[PDB]
C-alpha cells in the first residue's frame, strides 16, 4: 500500500560538474554564446518564432554546407542519427549498399545497412588508409551500388578524405554518394554541390561547439526522388524524411506535427552557426589547418609519431598519434585529466589501444590549447610508468 521506490538519496544533492577542457574527438567545450544560449525559456515547439528560427538553423546548414538543396534541416539525434536517417530513407531493402570502411564509421554504416536489410558491400581497409578513385570504381562495377558511403574526416583514424572526381564517377554509375562530414565540417575545406555530394551530414558538438544531441542533413535533388518514389515505407517513422521534410518548411503544404523538435538545443544551433558565420567558413578553415600544424611539429618535438604518414591526409580536426614504445595508453591519458582537467582519447574501432586522439574543435582548435595539452603530454611521458 506504499510506494515502492523512496526519493533517490544522490537527486537531493545540487547538481556539480568538474571544469573540464575537452581536447579530444569530441564533444568540445561551449563558448559562452552557446552556453547562454541553452539557459534560456521555452516557447511553443510549433510557434511562429521556432519555425524562424527554424528556417534561420536552414540557411546556416547551407552555409557552412555550401549548398541550395531545400531538402536541407536538422535531425533530432546525434550524429549516429543522422546517418540512419540517410540510409533508412534511402536505401530500400535490397539495394545494394557500397561502403568505404577504412574505421568505426563505415563499419556502423555496414552495421545500419545490414539492419535495414540491403546488400551490403565492404571496402575494407586498415586503419589509417583512404580510398583511391579506382579501388571505388571495382567496387562501383563488382556490385553496381545504388548508394556509396564515404567518411570525409575519419575522426577514427585522423585520415582526411580527398573528395574529388567522385562525382564524376559516381554519375558514372548512376550511384548516390553519401559523405560523412560530422567531424571535417568547420575544419577542412568541403561543398556539397561543387563536389557532388547526395546527402550530407554532421553533428553539432564537433567544430560547431554545440552541445550534443542534434545532427545537419541535406540531400540533393537526385536522392530526393529516391527517397520520395519509394514503394517501400522505410522502416523508422521518426525520421522518416517525408514526415522531416513537410515540418521542416520544406514541401508546399503546411507544417504537420511529427515530432516535438528539442527548441532549447535549436537555440544553441543557432547561436553556434550564426557564430561560424561571424567568422566566415574560410577563416574557420584557416584556424583547424595553421593549429593543426602547430600541434603537429609541437607533437613531434616531444618524440611522438603521426599515425597519419601523410601530411596532406591528416585531419586538422582529429590529430592520432602512436602511442610510445613503452607506455601503457591508459596512464597515459589518466594522467592528463587527473592532473590537467584535460580530455584526450586513446583509438575508436579498428584504432582501438593503437593510438591517442586530440582534437581541436571550433573555438577551441587554438594554438593556446595546443600548449596547454602539449605540456600534459610531456609530464605524462615523463612520470608515467614505461617498460
Known amino acids: 500500500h506504499k510506494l ?53 538553423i536552414k540557411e546556416g546548414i547551407q552555409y557552412v554546407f555550401q549548398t541550395r538543396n531545400p531538402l536541407t534541416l536538422v535531425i533530432s539525434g546525434s550524429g549516429h542519427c543522422a546517418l540512419e536517417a540517410a540510409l ?23 552495421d545500419i545497412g545490414e539492419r535495414i536489410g540491403a546488400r551490403v558491400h565492404p571496402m575494407t581497409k586498415d586503419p589509417g588508409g583512404h580510398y583511391t578513385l579506382q579501388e571505388v570504381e571495382e567496387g562501383l562495377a563488382q556490385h553496381k551500388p545504388v548508394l556509396l558511403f564515404l ?21 558514372r554509375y548512376k550511384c548516390l554518394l553519401l559523405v560523412d562530414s560530422v567531424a571535417s565540417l568547420g575544419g577542412t575545406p568541403l561543398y556539397m554541390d561543387r563536389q557532388g555530394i547526395d546527402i550530407l551530414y554532421s553533428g553539432s558538438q564537433k567544430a560547431l561547439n554545440a552541445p550534443p544531441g542534434t545532427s545537419l542533413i541535406s540531400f540533393s535533388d537526385k536522392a530526393k526522388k529516391k527517397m520520395y518514389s519509394r514503394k517501400t515505407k522505410p522502416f523508422s517513422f521518426y525520421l522518416d524524411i517525408k514526415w522531416l521534410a513537410n515540418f521542416w518548411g520544406c514541401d508546399d ?48 618535438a616531444l618524440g611522438l609519431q603521426l599515425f597519419v604518414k601523410d601530411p596532406a591526409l591528416r585531419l586538422p580536426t582529429v590529430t592520432t598519434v602512436a602511442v610510445p614504445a613503452g607506455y601503457d595508453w591508459r596512464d597515459i591519458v589518466s594522467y592528463v585529466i587527473d592532473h590537467f582537467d584535460i580530455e584526450i582519447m586513446g583509438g575508436l574501432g579498428p584504432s582501438t589501444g593503437k593510438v591517442l586522439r586530440i582534437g581541436l574543435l571550433g573555438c577551441n582548435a587554438t594554438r593556446e590549447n595546443v600548449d596547454r595539452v602539449t605540456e600534459a603530454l610531456r609530464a605524462a611521458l615523463q612520470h608515467c610508468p614505461k617498460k
Open 88 to 110: 533508412v530513407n534511402v536505401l530500400e531493402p535490397g539495394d545494394s549498399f557500397l561502403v568505404g570502411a577504412n574505421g568505426i564509421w563505415g563499419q556502423r554504416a555496414v
Open 4 to 56: 515502492l521506490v523512496t526519493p533517490p538519496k544522490a537527486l537531493l544533492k545540487p547538481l556539480s560538474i568538474p571544469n573540464q577542457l575537452l581536447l579530444g574527438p569530441g564533444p568540445s567545450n561551449l563558448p559562452p554564446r552557446i552556453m547562454a544560449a541553452g539557459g534560456l525559456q521555452m516557447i511553443g515547439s510549433m510557434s511562429k518564432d521556432m519555425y524562424q528560427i527554424m528556417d534561420e
Open 151 to 171: 567518411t570525409h574526416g575519419e575522426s577514427s583514424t585522423g585520415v582526411l578524405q580527398p573528395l574529388d572526381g567522385f562525382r564524376e564517377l559516381c554519375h
Open 253 to 300: 503544404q503546411p507544417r504537420m506535427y511529427h515530432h516535438t523538435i528539442p527548441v532549447i538545443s535549436l537555440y544553441s544551433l543557432r547561436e553556434s552557426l550564426a557564430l561560424i558565420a561571424e567568422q566566415g567558413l574560410e577563416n574557420s578553415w584557416r584556424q583547424h589547418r595553421e593549429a593543426a600544424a602547430y600541434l603537429h611539429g609541437r607533437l613531434q
